[PDB]
Amino acid sequence: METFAFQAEIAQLMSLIINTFYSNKEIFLRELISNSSDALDKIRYESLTDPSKLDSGKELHINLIPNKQDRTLTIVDTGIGMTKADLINNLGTIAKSGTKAFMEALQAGADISMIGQFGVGFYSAYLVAEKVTVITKHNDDEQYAWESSAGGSFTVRTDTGEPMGRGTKVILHLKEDQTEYLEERRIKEIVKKHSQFIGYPITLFVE
Template sequence: MDRTFQVDLRGVVDLLSHHLYGSPRVYVRELLQNAVDAITARRATEPDAPGRVRIEPPELTGDGTLRVHDTGVGLTEAQVHELLATIGRSSKRDELGFSRHEFLGQFGIGLLSCFLVADEIRVVTRHGDEPTVHWTGWSDGRYAVELAPADQARAEPGTTVTLVPRRDADQWFGLPTVTELARLYGSLLPVDVRVGDTPTTAGPPPWPTTPGAWLLARALDELGRPAEAAKLRAEHGIEEG
């Protein structure tokens, strides 16, 4: 008789911390990747959609949590159940019908990495005109989903991720540390990344709105495959150089 694997989330997080991620600090990178990918997905159908990511460490939220706000595509209730609560579900990109090289990371694993520094993750998200959805996940494997009441609905599409720090992870949430990590991982991202009101992006990056395609084309050039690189640039409107 076939049986289903039982997943110990704490064991998975321990595996990630010792074998996949070199340091808990990568949680900032993963959150930024998810935010930029969500903005990329939204701009595929709304080219003029805003591209903003704002990080608020505990010193700014005032309640001991860290929050990351983005103006991305957001998730529906069905996507929240499927993509935030299934370990190993690789990405929301395929669900939205986009090719993988348009995106920076893997949504499910990226969010899971936040359990390296947090005991609880809260996601408030809205997709298009759909209702705002609240998802809460705990490091022991439990999660809850509910539709937000009218007075807690997001005013526009996008997502806010809130992390409740673990007691032994406070050093990763201080304002100077978060600012340093946001600059390290976000300085070349093609969106406006801020910690509070402080910009961390260094200016326009050397690619258009498809950084994955730009990087892949450069790699094909280096591998001596100029025809494939030229085709990729033509498909995505990327200038030579």
């Protein structure tokens, strides 16, 4: 396991998301499903020129997996995934410019729900999660686990878990008062409200 320090802009945004009083927390799911949809668009587009991009899996889908025993809500996709370079470096650049633009917009009257317009909607996961584990597999790299409970640092390690083939799993270790997001009725309500027209099958798993 390797440990990395977040740059100051991202660190401040993670603190804002964790600490600000904001009741409309459900938007996190729309954001993560929308990120999953974009990653699926990317692998599908690549496959149009190179069909072998799908040798790691032809199915293009989004799975919503709650687990009451573990208190986790996992968003799984068979999208493009992320390489180690994406996880440590490329996404750190996106997170910096995106945070600066979002922090700017917030001072200019914008709402926390507009986070996705700034390329950092992934961070809305901290509205409901005390820890986020991202398991990912990109065609050009190995399976990795990125993780952060904020506090200024994140970890990256080669993942020994079940081989995914290709894609990303966003594991939300829910805060104790956010367990409503493990309830079938609640997840169904949110998906219907914000994600009804996503162009991939979304399966809401049950227990």
